[PDB]
Amino acid sequence: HGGGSGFGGQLRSWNPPSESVDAALLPNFTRGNARADDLVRNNGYAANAIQLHQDHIVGSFFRLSHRPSWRYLGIGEEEARAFSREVEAAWKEFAEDDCCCIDVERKRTFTMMIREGVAMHAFNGELFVQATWDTSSSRLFRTQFRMVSPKRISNPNNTGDSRNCRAGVQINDSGAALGYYVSEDGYPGWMPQKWTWIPRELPGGRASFIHVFEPVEDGQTRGANVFYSVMEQMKMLDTLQNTQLQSAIVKAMYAATIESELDTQSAMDFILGANSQEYAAAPVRLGGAKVPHLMPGDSLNLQTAQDTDNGYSVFEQSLLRYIAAGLGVSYEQLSRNYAQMSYSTARASANESWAYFMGRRKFVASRQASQMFLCWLEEAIVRRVVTLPSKARFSFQEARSAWGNCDWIGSGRMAIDGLKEVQEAVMLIEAGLSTYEKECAKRGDDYQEIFAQQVRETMERRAAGLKPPAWAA
Amino acid sequence: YHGGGSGFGGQLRSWNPPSESVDAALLPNFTRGNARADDLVRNNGYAANAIQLHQDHIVGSFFRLSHRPSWRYLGIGEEEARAFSREVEAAWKEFAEDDCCCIDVERKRTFTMMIREGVAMHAFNGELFVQATWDTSSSRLFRTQFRMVSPKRISNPNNTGDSRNCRAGVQINDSGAALGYYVSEDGYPGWMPQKWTWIPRELPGGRASFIHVFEPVEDGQTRGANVFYSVMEQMKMLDTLQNTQLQSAIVKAMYAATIESELDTQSAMDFILGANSQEQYAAAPVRLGGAKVPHLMPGDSLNLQTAQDTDNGYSVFEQSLLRYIAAGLGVSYEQLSRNYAQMSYSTARASANESWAYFMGRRKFVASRQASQMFLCWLEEAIVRRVVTLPSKARFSFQEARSAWGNCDWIGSGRMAIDGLKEVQEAVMLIEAGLSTYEKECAKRGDDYQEIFAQQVRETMERRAAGLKPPAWAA
Amino acid sequence: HGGGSGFGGQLRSWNPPSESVDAALLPNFTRGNARADDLVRNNGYAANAIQLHQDHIVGSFFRLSHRPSWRYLGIGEEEARAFSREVEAAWKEFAEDDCCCIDVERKRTFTMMIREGVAMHAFNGELFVQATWDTSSSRLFRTQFRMVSPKRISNPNNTGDSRNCRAGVQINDSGAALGYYVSEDGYPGWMPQKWTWIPRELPGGRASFIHVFEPVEDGQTRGANVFYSVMEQMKMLDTLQNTQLQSAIVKAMYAATIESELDTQSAMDFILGANSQEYAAAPVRLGGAKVPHLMPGDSLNLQTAQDTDNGYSVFEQSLLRYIAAGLGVSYEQLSRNYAQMSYSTARASANESWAYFMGRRKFVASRQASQMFLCWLEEAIVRRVVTLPSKARFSFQEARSAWGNCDWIGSGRMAIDGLKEVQEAVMLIEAGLSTYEKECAKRGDDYQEIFAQQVRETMERRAAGLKPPAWAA
Amino acid sequence: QREGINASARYPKNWVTTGDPAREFTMIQSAPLMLLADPDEFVSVQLA
């Protein structure tokens, strides 16, 4: 009834053409990406939002925590944890390598690649990573990675979409991804953009190509950026602010008017002073306050102008809050209008934003990082630089998820106060309902090396013979 | 009564709604309503915001299982039941969140993705459908994969009419219980035939082939209705309102000044504004210098229109309508609109707790049900392959105790700490007073007590071996 | 004397008839429910109201506590407790069945049953549930419940109402109904409409049918929905918001006015930029300020329009307060409005709302749950899944109320801040005024399984050898 | 049209007529115009 026709007609002419998400998105998929890129590259708010995503989803660092299923594999805890320590050390010394050769592009580190993927998935809807084997064997690990822009995946020869070939993506009957088509760079746009077909999964068990996105309906082959719900509104906001600024420029730039019957040059000389002794018209000096004389017929009237912000600030407030709601980031984070705010309200808003950010982190960054880690781990175990337990019930290729089971640690939730939150943390640990690993992970570190460094600190202190710390006996 | 009769002074004399069942009230335009809902969620920012709020609060980032089989009902020893629960939880934790990502046939979703996609489909569609099937590939230990299917695919085959037993391609018996569904294949591009296929809900052996989850409102309802029905027109018209307000502000701001000269346009421009001295209609563009007060002559004038307020009550009117839509959608207005201003601590707490209660109810009635159904379907295959050892002295087998063996609860994102310190004080004092339990508070926090105790004992022994300091739990 | 004629006439015509509520309601009984359904389906406020009603009366969970009158039945307390715990175990393993087998439709659980029933009683005045014995051997229980909307029950073939056959309800001379004439499903609207008569009570003492509503006076047969005093204002307010939105739309749409004797195309070209050099007249490029040069005899009148919200916010405040009073719900939770109210005021509002909800819960949901629970209990007893005490002085049919004595627990009062209420409960327990089962019920738990779980927890803690919890010795 | 099912392959309708000689009438409504997107693809040969 509400969706039927509308009260007194109303929406009698509106009826969306119900089709699948692919049918809704694909026809203008390239144009949508181009518009998103234009907005993000020429709009301050879009850049602020993507920066907020970058700093919150993963932060400035990302620490691995590899917890293999020893119980599932029938593996003793001692060798399981020793192997975990070995692989953690290898991964941490390899990922942040100053060689920067984790990617063949040699311009990014592991965290930088994760942030690139997060950003382009945010403003495009999906992320593409390719894993390759560098021919050079000088490095212990010859596996590198490459980020791919979503626009680089497209139908070869501009062929139309089919049942199985949708936008350069060959999928099976079940819809699972099978093959991808990629193109080399097109700069300058004058040479052929050739095509290359890459299987998503190499038959050996390794994942040659990984395409991660959050689908909204079955059969969705390409992700859609969150911007789609705010495109026109943010473009209109930018246009309105720009034209309002220009109008204010004009209204302020015109201030006074003089009218007279005689020659304009003489009138300006005898009214505005001018420098007639020297169309350039007649620029005048700016000295002290001056009062002219005028005969009847002439008149010099200043213009009262008009208030340059007659509610435009409130309109900006409403539009910015709408854009923030569409983006999923808090209004104060997006606009930095932290006025008229109370402690409890700011805390609640930051809390909900943090919950959304953590959800997105787990669903994008953690998954892609785990995938990259297992891809590297396959080469590591093949090159036997690490050794699985001999009593392994299942092989690594059989239990990749079990062997490569891992979570991640990003930037912690920086409290507005800190005092209350850390009192809460210490009261939690003393009450025993939480644990050191949980709270250290929340703050942004790992209890293992925290305890190791505590041992180092107390050893140094007792060697210096000054004072034992608050952990001894 | 008098209110429902005719109305004061006629008033609502033309209001005669055709009293009928929700099937007659919704099925004829069900596709159109769902299409409008999809349009709103794809275009309107508020709809997407509400959907994301549902996604992040109904379940959140994580969704953990807890198997609590009715050991007392089944006549099983508690230790044996605990061992069975531990082994099945181990299998589930190594299976559901696998990096294989092969829980779905689509090979691009996780189990949390399953739950959140399903709850979103129910939110903006009224119902959710998941096909639990068996795959022939032996590469995996488990040959069960899932696929959520939009309600659009469930439709009347060959777009024919509907009967007493058939409703939009749904077969219901005399009692009305559904038994089979005609699902149409995807139609991208629309240049190939849309073919239907009939699927039963359960296998002859009892395995649920097609899980359907929704919340009916009255007896006889067959299809769920998205909550957005009552607010479709409000959302659409407010979108149009913001668009037209943007346009009006643009034009009224853009037209700033005007000239009333008797002469030609270019003469007026280069004698009132300036410019000229061109390089090579479009009149002439004036460079933005400074001041440049002009001179005028009789019969000529310059008028700078003052325009008017760009937000003359628009913000407050939109705020009122946002309260309206928030009430309709069942989520807090402040969370929906990012209007976290001029709110007292008590007011914020009240809104947060009522919205959280609603979210938890929705969680238990949708996500818990769907997860339980799919988990028991998986456990069916697990016990078929005997990957888990059933107790020997069971008073009943699994076939008669599907629910008894599959009795489980779920824990999504825990109660978000609005203030943290006060909540932790109340929790610790509850523990001291003995009114709550470790498992209860861990569940409220989004955790479980057994593994947290195991981790605490592990850390205790580790630091004991290191000889640094015992923690706050000894002897 | 006020009720006679009024001051200066005024109500010289307002003389409503004096008749029974059934007499004043039944002729338009269908119309009222139709309009109520229309509002609840296509009104945001109504949907919010019903959702709040169900979520507060019941919420997520709704559990049982079986307290038979062992003192009256002459049964030992320990045997009574053993029977109570066994029947509770059977009931809990039966109710949460995933197949929704308690419903013949097999799509809703027990809590869903209760919530749907209370909601349809709210927006219709009454609830109808029937019990059926299927021949299916797949389950230990053959009794299932089926809901009936008030539309399905009416006078067969729309026959004229009589003294005892009122709206399809056959009532004895005294005033207690005994038979119902239900109608089959109305969809699709081409199959013949059929009627089936059902006695409310089976001859054997089992409630075949149950109809729950609260009457307002003697002789009442059908309930009245909560909208009977509010619906006209509700729909009028909906119309007001619609037309005000339309007015705002058109006022924002029409902003500028062009006046000129010139032909419209040339006028647009020379004034509003236009692009005639290259239906919908002509699109206008949105660009710079574009100061025009209208000739004498022309006008560029910018319409200042009018404020969108001229008192509509205050009007919505007043009307929503009236609707809240009519619905018995607090305006705050009704309209999601919580501004300019203090902690004490909010607590008072929540208190009165919670008191109303607890009364409504007891008088609707508790009664329905008790009825269906005893209906299941009689089947369980006759099925011998549970054994009656040997010392039973009275038979089950005699002591049906005594045997089936039980209460119910729904979602607790989640108060404003938690800490103050929990500490006051703790000090109540210290002072010995409240009791453990009372406060755990008010929190939504049961002291029995609470104690069992605490015993389990402390046993686990002893086994792990970390620390005895706050219950030992 | 009032029920909004104007687009359908087949349309059944059983409807009664009022008055003393009341009687039921059944109706099937259809609008078939089956075609082929490739008219020249098929070839028909009349034999002799």
Judged on CB neighbours under 10 Å (0-12, 13-18, 19+), A459 is exposed
Nearest CA in chain B to D6: B28
CA distance B281 to chain A (A): 22
What is the CA angle A292-A293-A299, rounded to 5?
Answer: 90
Mutation target for C interface from B230, B331, B378: give the one with most C CBs within 10 A. Answer: B230
Q: Is any Cβ of chain B less than 8 angstroms from the Cβ of C348?
A: no
Instruction: Tell me if B232 and A2 make a contact (CB, 8 A cut-off).
Output: yes
Q: Please tell me the distance from the alpha carbon of residue C106 to that of residue C114, in angstroms, as a whole number.
A: 15
Residues A63 and A373: beta-carbon distance below 8 Å: no
Closest CA to A232 of B45, C128, D24: B45
What is the CA angle C139-C142-C146, rounded to 5?
Answer: 115
Judged on CB neighbours under 10 Å (0-12, 13-18, 19+), D5 is middle
Q: Greatest CA separation found in chain D?
A: 63
Closest CA to C115 of C379, C469, C311, C368: C368
Q: Greatest CA separation found in chain B?
A: 111
Residues A302 and A256: beta-carbon distance below 8 Å: yes
Q: Which amino acid is at B141?
A: L
Q: Is any Cβ of chain D less than 8 angstroms from the Cβ of C191?
A: yes
Instruction: Tell me if A243 and C38 make a contact (CB, 8 A cut-off).
Output: no
Residues with Cβ within 8 Å of C97's Cβ and at least 6 positions away in sequence, in order, are B403, C109
Which of B29, B32, B159 is closest, CB to CB, to D9? B159
Q: Greatest CA separation found in chain C?
A: 110
- Distance between alpha carbon A219 and the CA centroid of its chain, in Å? 25
Going through C361-412 in order, the beta strands assigned E by DSSP cover 406-409
Going through C317-435 in order, the beta strands assigned E by DSSP cover 406-409
- Distance between alpha carbon C274 and the CA centroid of its chain, in Å? 58
- For residue A153, the 8-state DSSP code is B
Q: Please tell me the distance from the alpha carbon of residue B193 to that of residue B157, in angstroms, as a whole number.
A: 12
Instruction: Tell me if B161 and D12 make a contact (CB, 8 A cut-off).
Output: yes
Nearest CA in chain D to C191: D14
Residues A396 and A402: beta-carbon distance below 8 Å: no
Q: With beta carbons under 8 A apart, name residues in chain A contacting C239.
A: 7
CA distance A190 to chain B (A): 31
Q: Is any Cβ of chain D less than 8 angstroms from the Cβ of B35?
A: no
Tokens of A467: 């004072």
Residues A466 and A459: beta-carbon distance below 8 Å: no
CB atoms within 10 A of CB C137: 7
Q: Please tell me the distance from the alpha carbon of residue C262 to that of residue B92, in angstroms, as a whole number.
A: 79
Which other chains touch chain B, taking contact as 3+ CB pairs less than 8 Å apart?
A, C, D
Mutation target for C interface from A235, A236, A239, A243: give the one with most C CBs within 10 A. Answer: A243
DSSP string, C419-435: HHHHHHHHHHHHHTSS-
Q: With beta carbons under 8 A apart, name residues in chain A contacting B438.
A: 433
CA torsion B12→B14→B19→B23, rounded to 10°?
-110
Which of A160, A218, A402 is closest, CB to CB, to B149? A218
Residues with Cβ within 8 Å of A328's Cβ and at least 6 positions away in sequence, in order, are A226, A356, B49, B52
Going through A364-461 in order, the beta strands assigned E by DSSP cover 406-409
Residues C138 and C132: beta-carbon distance below 8 Å: no
Q: Please tell me the distance from the alpha carbon of residue B403 to that of residue C110, in angstroms, as a whole number.
A: 14
Q: Please tell me the distance from the alpha carbon of residue A226 to that of residue A218, in angstroms, as a whole number.
A: 18
Residues B106 and B147: beta-carbon distance below 8 Å: yes
Which of C38, C466, C467 is closest, CB to CB, to A1? C38
C-alpha separations of A399 from A387, A402, B384 in Å: 15, 5, 21
Cis before residue B189, ω within 30 degrees of 0? yes
Instruction: Tell me if A1 and C242 make a contact (CB, 8 A cut-off).
Output: no
Q: Which amino acid is at C364?
A: V
Q: With beta carbons under 8 A apart, name residues in chain C contacting D15.
A: 190
Instruction: Tell me if A348 and B340 make a contact (CB, 8 A cut-off).
Output: yes
Method: cryo-EM
| Alpha helices per DSSP H over B45-141 | 45-58, 71-74, 78-95, 111-125
Going through B107-194 in order, the beta strands assigned E by DSSP cover 127-131, 133-134, 144-145, 148-149, 170-172, 178-184
Decide: helix, strand or coil at residue A212: strand
Instruction: Tell me if D11 and B161 make a contact (CB, 8 A cut-off).
Output: yes
Residues B187 and A19: beta-carbon distance below 8 Å: yes
**Consecutive H or E run containing D25:** strand D24-29
Which of A2, A239, A250 is closest, CB to CB, to C289? A250
Q: Please tell me the distance from the alpha carbon of residue B327 to that of residue B330, in angstroms, as a whole number.
A: 5
CA distance B424 to chain C (A): 9
Closest CA to B212 of B203, B220, B201, B221: B201
Tokens of B89: 């939880």
Q: Which amino acid is at C462?
A: R
- For residue A248, the 8-state DSSP code is H
C-alpha separations of B217 from B110, B227, C39, C40, C440 in Å: 31, 11, 14, 11, 31
- For residue D15, the 8-state DSSP code is E
Residues C228 and C327: beta-carbon distance below 8 Å: no
CB atoms within 10 A of CB C269: 16
- For residue A8, the 8-state DSSP code is T
Judged on CB neighbours under 10 Å (0-12, 13-18, 19+), C320 is buried
Instruction: Tell me if B35 and A24 make a contact (CB, 8 A cut-off).
Output: no
Cis before residue C199, ω within 30 degrees of 0? no
Q: Please tell me the distance from the alpha carbon of residue C122 to that of residue C39, in angstroms, as a whole number.
A: 13
Q: Greatest CA separation found in chain A?
A: 111
Q: Please tell me the distance from the alpha carbon of residue A34 to that of residue A29, in angstroms, as a whole number.
A: 9
Residues C102 and C145: beta-carbon distance below 8 Å: yes
- Looking up tokens 């050739």 gives A194
Helices A44-57, A29-42: inter-axial angle, 10-degree rounding: 90
Residue A297 has φ and ψ, to the nearest 5°, of 105, -40
Q: Is any Cβ of chain C less than 8 angstroms from the Cβ of A303?
A: no
Could you say which residues from 101 to 160 on chain C have a Cβ atom under 8 Å away from some Cβ of chain B?
104-109, 111-112, 116, 119-120, 138, 146-149, 151-152
CB atoms within 10 A of CB B396: 15
Residues with Cβ within 8 Å of C460's Cβ and at least 6 positions away in sequence, in order, are B450, B453
Residues C318 and B323: beta-carbon distance below 8 Å: no
**Consecutive H or E run containing A146:** strand A143-148
Q: Please tell me the distance from the alpha carbon of residue B448 to that of residue B409, in angstroms, as a whole number.
A: 12
CB atoms within 10 A of CB A293: 7
Q: Please tell me the distance from the alpha carbon of residue B309 to that of residue A309, in angstroms, as a whole number.
A: 8
CA torsion A264→A270→A275→A276, rounded to 10°?
60
Long-range Cβ contacts of B179-182 (<8 Å, 24+ apart): B181/B129, B181/B154, B181/B210, B181/B212, B182/B154, B182/B155, B182/B156, B182/B157
Closest CA to B388 of B3, B86, B99, B5: B86
Q: Is any Cβ of chain C less than 8 angstroms from the Cβ of A9?
A: no
Walk across the sheet containing B178-184 and list its strands. Answer: B170-172, B178-184, B196-200
Which of A7, A246, A247 is closest, CB to CB, to C242? A7
Which of A8, A10, A246 is closest, CB to CB, to C288? A246
Residues C30 and C229: beta-carbon distance below 8 Å: no
Q: With beta carbons under 8 A apart, name residues in chain C contacting B19.
A: 30-31, 33-34, 37, 151
First vs last Cα of chain B: how many Å apart? 72
Q: Please tell me the distance from the alpha carbon of residue D20 to that of residue A154, in angstroms, as a whole number.
A: 71
Residues B172 and B201: beta-carbon distance below 8 Å: no
Q: With beta carbons under 8 A apart, name residues in chain A contacting B121.
A: 217
Residues with Cβ within 8 Å of C223's Cβ and at least 6 positions away in sequence, in order, are C121, C124, C125, C126, C213, C214, C215
- For residue D9, the 8-state DSSP code is S
Which of B28, B159, B160 is closest, CB to CB, to D4? B28
The number of residues making up chain A comes to 473
Instruction: Tell me if C295 and B333 make a contact (CB, 8 A cut-off).
Output: no
Nearest CA in chain C to B231: C44
Decide: helix, strand or coil at residue B313: coil
Q: Is any Cβ of chain D less than 8 angstroms from the Cβ of C190?
A: yes
Mutation target for C interface from B255, B335, B343, B463: give the one with most C CBs within 10 A. Answer: B255
Helices A77-95, A367-382: inter-axial angle, 10-degree rounding: 100
**Consecutive H or E run containing A377:** helix A367-382
Q: Are strands B144-145 and B64-67 parallel, antiparallel or unpaired?
A: unpaired
Q: Is any Cβ of chain A less than 8 angstroms from the Cβ of B94?
A: yes
Judged on CB neighbours under 10 Å (0-12, 13-18, 19+), D22 is exposed
Residues with Cβ within 8 Å of C139's Cβ and at least 6 positions away in sequence, in order, are C101
Q: Are strands A256-259 and B295-296 parallel, antiparallel or unpaired?
A: parallel
Pairs of residues, one from chain C and one from chain D, whose beta carbons lie less than 8 Å apart: 5
Mutation target for A interface from B100, B106, B115, B227: give the one with most A CBs within 10 A. Answer: B106
Q: Is any Cβ of chain A less than 8 angstroms from the Cβ of B212?
A: no
Tokens of A212: 């991660």
Q: Please tell me the distance from the alpha carbon of residue B450 to that of residue B456, in angstroms, as a whole number.
A: 10
Which other chains touch chain A, taking contact as 3+ CB pairs less than 8 Å apart?
B, C
Q: Please tell me the distance from the alpha carbon of residue A110 to that of residue B36, in angstroms, as a whole number.
A: 43
Residues with Cβ within 8 Å of B428's Cβ and at least 6 positions away in sequence, in order, are A427, A431, A433
Judged on CB neighbours under 10 Å (0-12, 13-18, 19+), D25 is exposed
Which of A14, A321, A370 is closest, CB to CB, to B99? A370
Instruction: Tell me if C191 and D14 make a contact (CB, 8 A cut-off).
Output: yes
Residues B242 and B43: beta-carbon distance below 8 Å: no
Q: Please tell me the distance from the alpha carbon of residue B463 to that of residue B68, in angstroms, as a whole number.
A: 33
Instruction: Tell me if B3 and C249 make a contact (CB, 8 A cut-off).
Output: no
Residues A64 and A408: beta-carbon distance below 8 Å: yes
Q: With beta carbons under 8 A apart, name residues in chain C contacting D14.
A: 190-191
Walk across the sheet containing A177-183 and list its strands. Answer: A165-166, A169-171, A177-183, A195-199
Instruction: Tell me if A23 and B187 make a contact (CB, 8 A cut-off).
Output: yes
Tokens of C220: 């009442």
DSSP string, B412-461: -S----SSSHHHHHHHHHHHHHTSS-HHHHHHHTT--HHHHHHHHHHHHH
Residue C260 has φ and ψ, to the nearest 5°, of -165, 140
Decide: helix, strand or coil at residue B224: coil
Which of B29, B158, B159 is closest, CB to CB, to D4? B29
Tokens of A412: 């912690």
Residue B71 has φ and ψ, to the nearest 5°, of -65, -40
Instruction: Tell me if B161 and D3 make a contact (CB, 8 A cut-off).
Output: no
CA distance A357 to chain B (A): 10
Q: Which amino acid is at B362?
A: R
Residues B199 and B180: beta-carbon distance below 8 Å: yes
Q: With beta carbons under 8 A apart, name residues in chain C contacting B176.
A: 104-105, 185
Q: Please tell me the distance from the alpha carbon of residue C454 to that of residue B439, in angstroms, as a whole number.
A: 9
C-alpha separations of B151 from A379, B38, B125, B177, B366 in Å: 43, 12, 7, 18, 16
Tokens of A256: 């006074």
Tokens of B443: 């569940």
CA distance A300 to chain B (A): 9
Closest CA to A353 of A376, A371, A372, A327: A327
Residue B426 has φ and ψ, to the nearest 5°, of -65, -35
Q: Please tell me the distance from the alpha carbon of residue C75 to that of residue C394, in angstroms, as a whole number.
A: 10
